[PDB]
């Protein structure tokens, strides 16, 4: 309950500065790199081998995997500056703006802005601009710059709306067999955004573009973590509203997807992270 994860649009200027500084330190110490790599690894871990499902996406473990990923990230932040917690990007309200790219999240003192079409959509403003911030490709080799291209695709010209979020919150089952991209009446799948896709979490990736657009190499962009903090909150809100439901599958899903299975690359189980308050943190909205 102690750590409070705040909306980005509410943070003081000094708070935004301290978050950025701490991420920059993490990167400099080489700690940031481990999080980009953990993510690419998990996506190449299919469950079972040959299938679409992987340790971190396109199945039941999606939500607990990323909650565990963010928890560890935030712990590392905390090591550097005990007063720093993970904010969340409330994309569904930015969606309501005339030009969501005008959002305060994209200012030069925070995330930086959109990509420069003259330079192949290389980002050149903000603390993460090419030259200030090195990036890595899928193979682990330098790629030479953060890229972004807001709303450029025909699939995802807009962020998801407050209605999309409310509607996913109405779903009664946490997931359904066969626990994959085709799962119907499934909260995990709806939030993941496959149903008439891309929606919700997937749609946000496509909207940002650049490294965010490609699931390996999505965490090269600090914004990845604000997006996933917002996804963690929506999940947290759902758990509150449907206190009677629990994670599924409890058993008989593919190994790595069940309630008491280790989530590659770690030993942590979905059970280990089910109660977000027992992990030491809460979202401002609860309070
Ligand atoms: Cu991911
Ligand atoms: Cu994601």
Residues 6 or more apart whose Cβ sits within 8 Å of residue 274: 64, 239, 246, 247
Q: Which of 106, 115, 128, 135 is nearest to 9 (CA)?
A: 106
- Binding-site residue set: 10, 13, 39, 46, 52, 57, 66, 68, 92, 109, 120, 163, 201, 205, 228, 242, 276-277, 284
The CB density around residue 251, as the number of other CB atoms within 10 Å, is: 9
Rounding to the nearest 10 degrees, give the CA dihedral for residues 77, 81, 83, 89.
-30
Residue 19: C-alpha distances to residues 54, 88, 114, 190, 228 (Å): 31, 12, 20, 31, 16
The Cα 243–Cα 232 span in angstroms is: 16
Q: Which of 160, 175, 165, 166 is nearest to 62 (CA)?
A: 175
The Cα 229–Cα 223 span in angstroms is: 10
Cβ atoms of 19 and 229 within 8 Å: the answer is no
Q: How far is the CA of 218 from the centre of ligand 2 (A)?
A: 8
Q: How far is the CA of 31 from the centre of ligand 1 (A)?
A: 18
The Cα 223–Cα 112 span in angstroms is: 10
The Cα 74–Cα 3 span in angstroms is: 10
Could you tell me if residue 97 is left (phi over 0), alpha (psi between -120 and 50 degrees) or otherwise beta?
beta
Nearest ligand to the C-alpha of residue 89? 2
Q: Which of 68, 4, 132, 44 is nearest to 270 (CA)?
A: 68
The Cα 221–Cα 240 span in angstroms is: 30
- Binding-site residue set for Cu(2+): 39, 57, 66, 201, 205, 228
Cβ atoms of 189 and 195 within 8 Å: the answer is yes
Per domain, the residue ranges of the chain are 1-287
Q: How far is the CA of 192 from the centre of ligand 1 (A)?
A: 10
Structure-solving method: X-ray
**Residue 136: strand pairing partners:** 142
The phi, psi pair for 282, rounded to 5°, reads -150, 155
The Cα 169–Cα 7 span in angstroms is: 19
Q: Which of 251, 252, 242, 240 is nearest to 276 (CA)?
A: 240
Experimental resolution (Å) = 2.0
Q: How far is the CA of 213 from the centre of ligand 2 (A)?
A: 9
Q: How far is the CA of 216 from the centre of ligand 2 (A)?
A: 10
The dihedral through the CA atoms of 18, 89, 122, 98 has a sign that is negative
The dihedral through the CA atoms of 146, 149, 154, 155 has a sign that is positive
Q: How far is the CA of 220 from the centre of ligand 2 (A)?
A: 12
Question: For residue 86, with 0-12 CB atoms within 10 Å meaning exposed, 13-18 middle and 19 or more buried, which class applies?
Answer: buried
Helices (H), ranges, the chain: 13-29, 31-43, 62-80, 91-94, 162-169, 187-192, 200-208, 223-241
Assigned token pair, 3: 């750590």
Beta strands in 111-173 (DSSP E): 115-116, 122-123
Q: Which of 174, 173, 175, 283 is nearest to 236 (CA)?
A: 283
Residue 198: C-alpha distances to residues 106, 159, 178 (Å): 23, 10, 20
CATH 1.10.1280.10 matches 1-287:
yes
Cβ atoms of 54 and 46 within 8 Å: the answer is yes
The CB density around residue 244, as the number of other CB atoms within 10 Å, is: 6
Q: How far is the CA of 42 from the centre of ligand 1 (A)?
A: 8
Widest Cα–Cα separation across the chain: 53
Cβ atoms of 216 and 35 within 8 Å: the answer is no
The Cα 229–Cα 6 span in angstroms is: 10
Cβ atoms of 2 and 286 within 8 Å: the answer is no
């Amino acid at each position: 309950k102690y750590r409070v994860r705040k909306n980005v649009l509410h943070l003081t200027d000094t708070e935004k500065r301290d978050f950025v500084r701490t991420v920059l330190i993490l990167k400099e110490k080489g700690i940031y790199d481990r999080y980009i790599a953990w993510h690419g690894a998990a996506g190449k871990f299919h469950t079972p081998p040959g299938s679409d499902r992987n340790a971190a996406h396109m199945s039941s473990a999606f939500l607990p995997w990323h909650r565990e990923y963010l928890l560890r990230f935030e712990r590392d932040l905390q090591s550097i500056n005990p007063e720093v917690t993970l904010p969340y990007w409330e994309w569904e309200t930015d969606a309501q703006m005339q030009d969501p790219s005008q959002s305060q999240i994209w200012s030069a003192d925070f995330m930086g802005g959109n990509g420069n079409p003259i330079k192949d959509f290389i980002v050149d403003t903000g603390p993460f601009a090419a030259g200030r911030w090195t990036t890595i490709d899928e193979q682990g080799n330098p790629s030479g710059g953060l890229k972004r291209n807001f709303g450029a695709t025909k699939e995802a010209p807009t962020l998801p709306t407050r209605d999309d979020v409310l509607n996913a919150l109405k779903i009664t089952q946490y997931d359904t067999p066969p626990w994959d991209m085709t799962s119907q009446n499934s909260f995990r799948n709806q939030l993941e955004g496959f149903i008439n896709g891309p929606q919700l979490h997937n749609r946000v990736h496509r909207w940002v573009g650049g490294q965010m657009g490609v699931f390996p190499t999505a965490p090269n962009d600090p914004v990845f973590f604000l997006h996933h903090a917002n996804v963690d909150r929506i999940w947290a809100v759902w758990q509150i509203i449907h206190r009677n439901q629990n994670y599924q599958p409890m058993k008989n899903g593919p190994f790595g997807q069940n309630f008491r299975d280790p989530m590659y690359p770690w030993n942590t189980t979905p059970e280990d992270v089910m109660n977000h308050r027992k992990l030491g943190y809460v979202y401002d909205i609860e309070l």
